[PDB]
Amino acid sequence: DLADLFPGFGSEWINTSSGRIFARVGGDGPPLLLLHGFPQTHVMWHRVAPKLAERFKVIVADLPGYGWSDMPESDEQHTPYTKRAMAKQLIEAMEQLGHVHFALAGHDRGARVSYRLALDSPGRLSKLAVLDILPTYEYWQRMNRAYALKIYHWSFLAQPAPLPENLLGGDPDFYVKAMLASYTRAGDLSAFDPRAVEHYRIAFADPMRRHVMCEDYRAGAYADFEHDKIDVEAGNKIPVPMLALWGASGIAQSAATPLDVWRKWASDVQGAPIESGAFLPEEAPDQTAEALVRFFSA
């Protein structure tokens, strides 16, 4: 019922102690993990993954609780869907494949999993790439009226259950599509493959998957923030050589000077703006792929 946007890629259901992680696996060479964000799945990499496959062994994984990944039971602190736990679970997953030192690239929620992984376990990463994000700490500290209105859903979805859930039940199709079109450059869905939008909408049409997304944004308003406050108070920087890509019309640039912020969180960081909205790998696939290939190859 859902299209194949990764021709040639296999399908792996990697076992962890918190549940199965689904991923499309293609190419050969150095291991490169790709992590998606909200409200998308692994298929958001379908326009750049084949190019990366020509050079690397590309693992395109659904986040814990997302897509076809299992949904581990959450708790009163939203632990399994905190960026620290997600990182632990994916580290565990990559160990099942023999990948204990790999390249990592993330977008939105996946980028947050990524930099948290780098802080907690720098050893697991050769190079890091974060796409159109700032540290979760940075958004909350810089929170103003402009901030609050634009990215309203950081506060909205972090509301205690079942208030966001019950509201999302009203028109999940509309909401998930609105979340996609609102952060592009054109303001519509033209950037997204209609088949890819189907993957997103189908997953979002399930109440259980939506609950996970809320538990995600709850973690991002509490545990993730507290985890980030500890680091920023200690003065810990990410030692992993990392790349920061953001859309010129993206979310991160309206907030701050992206590479100036990431220089405060990482000692070895380079970055560039790309003519795009928030959804870089779909809006500007050629440039995004090129940036990643050249960076991970160096």
Ligand X SMILES: *[C@H](Cc1ccc(C(F)(F)F)cc1)C(=O)O
Contact status: 255 vs ligand X (CB under 6 A): yes
CB of 154 to a second copy, least distance (A): 7
The answer to whether 132 and 250 have CB atoms below 8 angstroms apart is: yes
Contact status: 86 vs a second copy (CB under 8 A): no
Contact status: 145 vs a second copy (CB under 8 A): yes
Contact status: 169 vs a second copy (CB under 8 A): yes
Strands 21-26 and 57-61: antiparallel
Contact status: 213 vs ligand X (CB under 6 A): no
DSSP code per residue over 189-214: STTS-HHHHHHHHHHHTSHHHHHHHH
CB of 156 to a second copy, least distance (A): 5
CB of 81 to a second copy, least distance (A): 17
What distance in Å separates the CA atoms of residue 102 and residue 127, rounded to the nearest whole number?
A: 7
Dihedral (CA of 153, 156, 162, 167) sign? negative
Q: How far apart are the first and last CA of the chain?
A: 40
> Which pairs with CB-CB distance under 8 Å and at least 24 residues apart come from 90-94?
90/16, 90/21, 90/33, 90/35, 90/61, 90/64, 90/117, 91/117, 91/121, 91/124, 92/16, 92/17, 92/18, 93/14, 93/15, 93/16, 93/21, 93/23, 93/61, 94/31, 94/33, 94/59, 94/124
Contact status: 143 vs a second copy (CB under 8 A): yes
Residue number, 2 or 208, with CB nearest to a second copy: 208
* Contact pattern from residue 93 through residue 132 relative to ligand X, giving x for each residue in contact according to CB under 6 A and a dash for the rest: ---------------xx--x-------------------x
DSSP code per residue over 215-234: HHHHHTTTHHHHHHHHHHHH
Residue number, 166 or 267, with CB nearest to a second copy: 166
Binders of a second copy among residues 191 to 250 (CB under 8 A) are 221, 225
Contact status: 158 vs ligand X (CB under 6 A): no
Strands 125-131 and 102-107: parallel
What distance in Å separates the CA atoms of residue 141 and residue 274, rounded to the nearest whole number?
A: 25
Q: Which stretch binds a second copy (CB under 8 A): 72-80, 173-181, 207-215, 240-248?
A: 173-181
CB of 231 to ligand X, least distance (A): 16
Residue number, 202 or 221, with CB nearest to ligand X: 221
Q: Which of 2, 3, 161, 163 binds a second copy (CB under 8 A)?
A: 163
Return the one option of a second copy, ligand X, none that residue 143 interacts with (CB less than 5 to 8 A, by type).
Answer: a second copy
Q: What does the DSSP 8-state code read for residue 238?
A: B
Contact status: 287 vs a second copy (CB under 8 A): no
Residue number, 149 or 298, with CB nearest to a second copy: 149
- E strand segments, the chain: 10-14, 21-26, 31-35, 57-61, 102-107, 125-131, 242-247, 269-274
CB of 133 to ligand X, least distance (A): 4
Contact status: 171 vs a second copy (CB under 8 A): yes
Q: What residues line the site for a second copy (CB under 8 A)?
A: 140-141, 143-145, 147-149, 152, 154-156, 158-159, 162-163, 166-171, 174-175, 178, 221, 225
Q: Site residues (CB under 6 A) for ligand X? A: 37-38, 108-109, 112, 132-134, 139, 151, 251-252, 255, 278
